[PDB]
Amino acid sequence: ALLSFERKYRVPGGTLIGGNLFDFWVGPFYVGFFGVTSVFFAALGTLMILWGASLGDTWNPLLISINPPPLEYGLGAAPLREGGIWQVVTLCAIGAFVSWAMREVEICRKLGIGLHIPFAFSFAIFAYITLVVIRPALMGAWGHGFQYGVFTHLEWVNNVGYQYGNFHYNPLHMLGISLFFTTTLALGLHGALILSAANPETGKEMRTPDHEDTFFRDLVGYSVGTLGIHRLGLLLALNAAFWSAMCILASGTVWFDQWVFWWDWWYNLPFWADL
Amino acid sequence: DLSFTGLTDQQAQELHSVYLQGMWLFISVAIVAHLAVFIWRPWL
Amino acid sequence: DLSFTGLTDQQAQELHSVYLQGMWLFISVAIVAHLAVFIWRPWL
Amino acid sequence: DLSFTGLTDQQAQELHSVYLQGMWLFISVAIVAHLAVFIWRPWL
Amino acid sequence: DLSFTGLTDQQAQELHSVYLQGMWLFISVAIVAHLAVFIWRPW
Amino acid sequence: DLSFTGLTDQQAQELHSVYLQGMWLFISVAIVAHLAVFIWRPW
Amino acid sequence: AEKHYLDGATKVGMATMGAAAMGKGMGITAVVFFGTVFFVVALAFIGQFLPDRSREAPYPNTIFQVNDIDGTVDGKYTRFA
Amino acid sequence: SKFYKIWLIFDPRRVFVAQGVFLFLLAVMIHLMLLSNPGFNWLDISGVKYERV
Amino acid sequence: SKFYKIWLIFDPRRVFVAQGVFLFLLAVMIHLMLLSNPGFNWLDISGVKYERV
Amino acid sequence: SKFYKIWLIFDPRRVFVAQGVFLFLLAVMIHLMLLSNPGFNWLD
Amino acid sequence: KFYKIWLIFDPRRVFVAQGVFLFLLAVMIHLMLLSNPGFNWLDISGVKYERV
Amino acid sequence: EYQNIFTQVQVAGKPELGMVEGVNLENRTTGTTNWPILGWFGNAQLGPIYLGTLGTMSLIFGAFWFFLVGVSFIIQADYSPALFLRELFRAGLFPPAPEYGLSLSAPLMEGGLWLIASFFLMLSVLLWWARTYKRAADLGMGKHTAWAFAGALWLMFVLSFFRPILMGSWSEAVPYGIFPHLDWTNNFSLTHGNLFYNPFHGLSIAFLYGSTMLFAMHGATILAVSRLGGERELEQIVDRGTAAERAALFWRWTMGFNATMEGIHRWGWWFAVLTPVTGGIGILLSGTVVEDWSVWAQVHGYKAL
Amino acid sequence: MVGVNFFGDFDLASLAIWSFWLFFALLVYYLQTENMREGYPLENEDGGPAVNQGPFPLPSQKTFKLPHGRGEVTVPDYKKEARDVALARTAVNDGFPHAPTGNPMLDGVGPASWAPRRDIPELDGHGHAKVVPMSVASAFFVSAGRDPRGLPVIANDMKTVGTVTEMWVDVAEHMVRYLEVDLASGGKCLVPMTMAIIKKHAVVVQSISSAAFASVPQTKSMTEISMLEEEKICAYFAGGTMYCADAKPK
């Protein structure tokens, strides 16, 4: 089942590894070499998650959790029931995420278009790899990675947050939150503006992109423009990902006290130090 | 005939024989490695 | 004459014959492995 | 004589008969397995 | 006959030559420094 | 001479000459400074 | 030659082509894998030079006694603590 | 009866793929449910029966 | 029976890719499950058998 | 027997590259599975 | 014949990036050694010459 | 390959003053400046703005709220310009104490000024809402922006108006300091058990993450199909070109389903709007219905034990 | 309402969350069906209707009114694509690529595919042509960055095909959109600004060979450009990114 314009785009080419060996579709999904590897990694990780769930006491999909090795194993490979399943899933997750991006590259090459999407997804991948690889390697234990579970990884977020007092007082965390909030606002405004122009008041002709420039210029005095809003949303989201990763990387590696005490550089400036 | 790859019947036989030679060489080296490991540290 | 894959009935038969030989070889090896493992450490 | 899939009535019949043979073989294997499992560890 | 970077062929050759010289000197001096810091405080 | 830097070969030699003069002057001042610091408080 | 081999040489040209291709695949995979392992080993090595308080953070995951697959029902990684 | 006319409705390729996926997932889930229960975990049962197999 | 007519329905290239993926995945899973059970982990069993192999 | 006909459906160049990739990945699985077991890690 | 790469890649960007990378690598190796109280040439001097 | 991340050559003609579609022109300023450092990323024109009744009133009320917060800071600094600057982020105008309930009788420097400022802040955001509505109405556009702003305003009003009334105390509203309102957020999670186990807090986070991820995806998609007339999204809605097709085929081949040029903006609208809508629901239920989301999660089978 | 529960542990909070799940399923249905206004019904690989169409039925028809006397547009339109595509399937099964039967770039298939848009210029809010040469706009001027006019243009093989002689700007959004190239071949050519990199010495186009520049889709007029001509030109360059990649150095 092809979309009514799809056929002319289903041509050979664009692959990176295996030529025409995997250059075919399965239903909607393009496969390619990295579709084979992403399917295998995703299936093996899911299936080890299910196997680890079987070794616990619940089948409730909101209580299932695969836990990293204890700290005493350091950066070694743990026995498979004492954190090893977590390491297998983590390696499978990295394999699938990276394979997914490489598969996205091949699809972009076949439909000759830019590579912006795999690039952005790689920023998301980097945030994940910072969480499970880079930070625990610097700390010297895989057990600083977060447990895999719908509500138990939130216990990780809680424990790590409250290790450094109130995590709000983390300047990179502040910067990341502002970027998350701002990208949501920008998505709201961009979607609203497009919908308003395409869906006018009843009986009116469809609005032009001039009308939407005019709408923001009237409302705030500025209009970034059609090309500009997409550049802006892309860079806002990518910066949110990157500065979040820096936020968490700094905690426990280069900063160790309550993050509130970081601002004592400003509060202890010598002229107003004692006031 | 049924040729997706564009080879002929005779090319496929020759390339299969070469492939088999390479694969048996690989397996024999693997066997030597496994005998060495088993002598060192037997797993069965 | 129903054919989705484009094969004829003869090519399908030949392909299936070779496929079955491959499958039977694989299954025979697996049977031998399971018999050996069951002798070594039975699981039923 | 119209159909969604484009298959003729005769093609559907032979298709269904082969599919039924496959399903029956699968089911008979499953039945033998369930008798074995029930004799070994009855669950009712 | 213009390049992508704007360099002619000749400028590319001399630039690559001096690049290799620079890398050679960097590595040689680094080797000398490692020799000196090994004779001083062995590790 | 619409070069990438808008200079000429003749301007390049003189600019490089003043660059090398300044560089060697800075390095000589630095080496005598390090000599003085090493005599005063060797590391 | 609208075939990546035509004459083939039937035992030596084919063998060299196959060795080249399989070695290429294995070699790129080896390069990627050892680059990744080296990056992780380098990060661990660097982390050895961080302040000692980089090794004071407690275990950040909660063991819930319903996910505890170590073998004993205690809510912790047994044989350690 | 005359259920063959399902093949006038559904394409055989899609149905066979869907059936295979369904059967695989069902078999996996049943085995996992048995293994999670220590009354039908055959590995541990055999460990007990043969005195650590 | 006359199951060979599967090849009039399913193309062999995609079938072989899917079959290889599934079979390798199943083999890896079963081996992993056996390694996680302390009655069928052959490395530790041999460790006990020979007094540290 | 007739297994050489596999090269009529899958191009041997691509299979050789893919097989190199697969063999290295299988090797890394096995080696670091061994490293996971204390009794078979050879680093220490 | 490798010099042709400089007809493809801009030497300015490549040179600056390589320079920054080497500089940071050297800086952080020096920080390792100065963090390590075994090489730490400054402090050890304050013991070789007895505060020098 | 040119990544359409920055403009290469900027161009400018006569400044664009806007479309005339029922806007009162005498309320639209006439002066534009053209600022090329912005033209690297987006538009360079700092255009005219519209200033009518609603905007003027909203600006007056908001500016007065801002002024009153500032004055409170000056007074609690004991008049010191040094403490004022040192504490610009650490000071807050706090609501009345719990003992005053919802009454309007609390000392001026212990909640009264907070009440007055809060009233004027309420007035300005509602007037700004009416502005967002009326600027769309004057151009003949749909009202999607005002609805989206209403969702965010709903979270704002449950934060300081609706929930404190249902709890019977102004003391539970958020203070007007940079650091103290973060302290307020932390305290709010700490007093209601743990707000991670609030299902609407979970859903709000899902929509925040999803809206960030969605607009990474959409900005990357539009940039990738910019080689074709891609970012002219309007006129691709009504005359589909290859940019829309290839954008659809990328996501169809990748994840098995796709959007349309018009419909991706509905997804984004709903993901953005649902973040404060769902979040406000979860705050409203906190304290009013659930006191301790941790034990509630334990009872409702998604926290262990 | 604390501790007071319907149904024996079913709360106002439980009620709210279940209500949200119901609403969200309805919203997902609405969003998915809204996104089915292009490309449906699904076809098979021979241009006929597909056997399967998916769990979601098509939405009701919706109409757009177009300004400046450009009629109405109703979607979903149920119409099939209004161009022929010179491909041919490489397998009797489904899910395999179709191969070009001639020159992929000249035929307009694959990454060189163009959609059959209207042969009229896109308009700005005042009804004028939206994208025009600066000889027509006449109040536009270069404001920042380097002017490419007069520079040589170099193809994806390092050969120069001509010089930039004119820029085509979008008069609504103040942007350059095309570079007009005068070719040593003998004619002219429009190059999308999104596919050109301006440098000090030249504008480099790393998607198209020098031989490809001899056949770039032309415009009827040199004062305005239709959306169909825009599609063809941009598709030609984007397809070159595949069908010209072997001409690159090394």
Ligand code: BCL
């Ligand atoms: C007690 C808790 C602490 C606290 C402790 C922490 C800690 C600890 C951390 C954060 C982090 C973050 N916090 Mg905080 N945080 C608190 C309060 C807040 C508040 C608030 C209003 O109070 C906000 C808005 C935030 C906001 C944020 C973000 C800036 C950031 C999370 C985004 C992120 O990392 O994305 C990054 C995105 C990803 C990692 C996603 C990766 C996805 C991958 C690539 C793909 C997965 C696919 C999946 C498996 C597929 C399934 C298949 C299906 C078919 C779909 N925090 C309080 C004070 N916060 C985190 C951070 O910065 O992380 C980097 C972090 O570690």
Ligand code: BCL
């Ligand atoms: C210890 C801290 C607690 C915590 C306590 C809270 C509390 C308390 C709240 C949130 C809320 C939110 N939390 Mg939190 N949260 C924590 C951990 C996290 C983490 C994390 C990784 O750990 C993340 C990602 C989040 C994420 C989020 C957001 C999804 C959500 C706010 C949605 C929104 O729209 O906001 C941005 C939108 C607004 C703030 C709306 C108001 C903005 C108005 C419209 C502005 C108008 C203009 C203004 C008046 C004037 C100035 C303009 C002039 C131009 C100058 N929380 C932990 C558990 N969280 C909120 C929520 O919805 O909870 C359910 C909330 O109230």
Ligand SMILES: CC[C@H]1c2cc3[nH]c4c(c3C)C(=O)[C@H](C(=O)OC)c4c3nc(cc4[nH]c(cc(n2)[C@@H]1C)c(C(C)=O)c4C)[C@@H](C)[C@@H]3CCC(=O)OC/C=C(\C)CCC[C@H](C)CCC[C@H](C)CCCC(C)C
């Ligand atoms: C879908 C939900 C998201 C969203 C949506 C949203 N917000 C919106 C909109 C939408 C759809 C608008 O239409 C509206 C808007 O116009 O945006 C451009 C708005 C907007 N969202 C804004 C902010 C905002 N949105 C936020 C959040 C979000 N908004 C959500 C993530 C946040 C966060 C995360 O905290 C903030 C801070 C504004 C930019 C704008 C609303 C404008 C407004 O409220 O105006 C009221 C005016 C005032 C309070 C006046 C302040 C005046 C100055 C202080 C004067 C300074 C004078 C001088 C410096 C001296 C002063 C002191 C004395 C001497 C006077």
Ligand SMILES: CCCCCCCCCCCCCCCCCC(=O)OC[C@H](COP(=O)(O)OCCN)OC(=O)CCCCCCCCCCCCCCCCC
């Ligand atoms: C092992 C367990 C597996 C599942 C557990 C993982 C968690 C799942 C939670 C999110 C669900 C993600 C699953 C997405 C399914 C991906 C497959 C897919 O969507 O494609 C199949 C289907 C067919 O596509 P098509 O034929 O084009 O449909 C139109 C024709 N009638 O395409 C369609 O169905 C089109 C409809 C699109 C579906 C909309 C996606 C909704 C995502 C919004 C989620 C955001 C809020 C999540 C809250 C999280 C809270 C924890």
Ligand SMILES: COC(C)(C)C/C=C/C(C)=C/C=C/C(C)=C/C=C/C(C)=C/C=C/C=C(C)/C=C/C=C(/C)CC/C=C(/C)CCC=C(C)C
């Ligand atoms: C749970 O984790 C673990 C991993 C514990 C257990 C996992 C177990 C599993 C699932 C293992 C999976 C094993 C599999 C599927 C192994 C498959 C192995 C195969 C197919 C190996 C094939 C090798 C073929 C080779 C090396 C062919 C080489 C051919 C050439 C042409 C090379 C050219 C060079 C020469 C010299 C050719 C010779 C030519 C002449 C003329 C002599």
Ligand SMILES: COC(C)(C)C/C=C/C(C)=C/C=C/C(C)=C/C=C/C(C)=C/C=C/C=C(C)/C=C/C=C(\C)CC/C=C(/C)CCC=C(C)C
């Ligand atoms: C915390 O870090 C610790 C301290 C651990 C240990 C430190 C480790 C370090 C510092 C590692 C790094 C070592 C480096 C960076 C060595 C490299 C030195 C370089 C780049 C030397 C190059 C020097 C160039 C010079 C000195 C030229 C100087 C002067 C002129 C050109 C004249 C005046 C200057 C200018 C710009 C005007 C131009 C002059 C004319 C005539 C036009």
Ligand SMILES: COC(C)(C)C/C=C/C(C)=C/C=C/C(C)=C/C=C/C(C)=C/C=C/C=C(C)/C=C\C=C(\C)CC/C=C(\C)CCC=C(C)C
């Ligand atoms: C207690 O826990 C409970 C929760 C476990 C979990 C679930 C309980 C439930 C709800 C279980 C329900 C299970 C169901 C619905 C089971 C149904 C199973 C079926 C329908 C199995 C059918 C298998 C059919 C097969 C294997 C058919 C054919 C195989 C073949 C080899 C036939 C080949 C077909 C060919 C050759 C067609 C070619 C013909 C032509 C003319 C080209």
Ligand SMILES: COC(C)(C)C/C=C/C(C)=C/C=C/C(C)=C/C=C/C(C)=C/C=C/C=C(C)\C=C/C=C(/C)CC/C=C(/C)CCC=C(C)C
């Ligand atoms: C030089 O001149 C000055 C004095 C400018 C120096 C100024 C310094 C300034 C302006 C400092 C201001 C600082 C800060 C920190 C401003 C921002 C504060 C924050 C974080 C505000 C966030 C507020 C969040 C919410 C949810 C606020 C309000 C929500 C409402 C629903 C408002 C309506 C509530 C009530 C109780 C209305 C009361 C109505 C009656 C009738 C009593």
Ligand SMILES: COC(C)(C)C/C=C/C(C)=C/C=C/C(C)=C\C=C\C(C)=C\C=C\C=C(C)\C=C\C=C(\C)CC/C=C(/C)CCC=C(C)C
């Ligand atoms: C705890 O228990 C768990 C949870 C494991 C759950 C259990 C799950 C299981 C076990 C699920 C099911 C597994 C199933 C249903 C099936 C496995 C079937 C197998 C092993 C199929 C293997 C086939 C092997 C073959 C076909 C080898 C083929 C080799 C060849 C060289 C064949 C060459 C073929 C052809 C056609 C050559 C080309 C010829 C021409 C004329 C072109």
Ligand SMILES: [Fe+3]
């Ligand atoms: Fe958009």
